[PDB]
Structure formats: C-alpha cells, structure tokens
Design a binder for this molecule. Sequence first.
Ligand SMILES: [Ca+2]
Length: 223
Amino acid sequence: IVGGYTCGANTVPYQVSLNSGYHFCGGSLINSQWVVSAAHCYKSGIQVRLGEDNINVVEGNEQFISASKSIVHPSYNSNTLNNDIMLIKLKSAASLNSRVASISLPTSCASAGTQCLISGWGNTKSSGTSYPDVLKCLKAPILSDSSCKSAYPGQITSNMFCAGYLEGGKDSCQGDSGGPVVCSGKLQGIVSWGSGCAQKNKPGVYTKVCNYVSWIKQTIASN
Ligand SMILES: [Ca+2]
C-alpha cells in the first residue's frame, strides 16, 4: 500500500497472508475453512497465515494452516486478468476469535463513490522498493465506470472495478495482490492489477466479487 496508514494490530481480522516460505499475496477469510484470493496468486505449497500483524515476528495471535486444495475460476484468463479469483481450502478449520474473523460476501454490488478499506503488506513507495513488516491500510472510493475505462481503454470488463484516486499518491501495490477491498461491511473487491502504483490517472483495478457469489457458494458447498 502506497499513501496509507498503519492499520493497527488485528484491526483487520479477516486479512490473510499467503506464504510459500515468504509472503507473496494477501487473502480474505470467508469462513473457518475457506479463503478467497486472486487467481494470479496461484502457486503450489501454500500456507495460510491468519491473525498476523508483523509477518516477521511471532507475536502470539497467529494461526498457520496449510492449504488442502486450490480452485482457480473456470474462466480465468492470465493474459487479461479477467476473472481473477481463486478459492483456497484450509487443511484444518481456523479458530475464530477477536483477531481472526471472517468477512461477509456481498448481497449486491456497490455503487461508485462508496468508501472502501483496502489492506496489505505490499510495497509502500510509488517509485522504488520498500516492504513493510506490519499491515498497511487505505481508505479509497470506488470510481466511476467511465473513469476506470478511460484510464485503461479496451482492458476493463464487467468483472472489474477501479478504486482509488485519479490524482495518484494513494494505491495498492506489488504484494497487496489477492487482498481484501471491504465496503459497507462486505467483501466487494480483490486486489488485482494496475499500471504501476499510486501514479496519476492510473487507479488500482479490482476483481468485482459481487459477480461471483453464486460460484463461491456452490463451489464451497461441493468441496
Ligand atoms: Ca506475526
């Protein structure tokens, strides 16, 4: 996250770290057995790390659970990043507490101008490299249709939205991928892509979770 703030310990109890010997992506706990992330975050050998704040120290509240299976969306296109969503089933159920909570799935899509919370352990500079050890947060609006597609002509689908600031300075970045965008209590987004970070006229692009609820429910019920 660029231009954000230090969330504060376990203030985002649904935020997950995906680890393969190191942190590589974020995720969202949707129930004691399932995590949602981005399909471009697919790897083998995933361990899901819950209740984190400092990903470089063992601070007590953490639960480290291996993935038993991963399911990338049937129509994921790695070239376009259309349908950038994946489900990750935990080997063993997580214990839900004050530091580890699930996030609700949307009942409807959010409108432009809605205030969201975006969080992650990604790079905090728009120019150069600086990776935080602690969770970073960002308050950002959902941008209009037109503003999103004007920035990225011919690249935006129905399954995407933009959020952030046209003036730049505030955005998600490398390492935030697969992490949550929570608006009015619901998981509306997944950190997907963008043209660099916190650059002018290039907002972040997010997977539009409200299009996928049916798929998520049927899939989780059958697996
Ligand atoms: Ca820790």
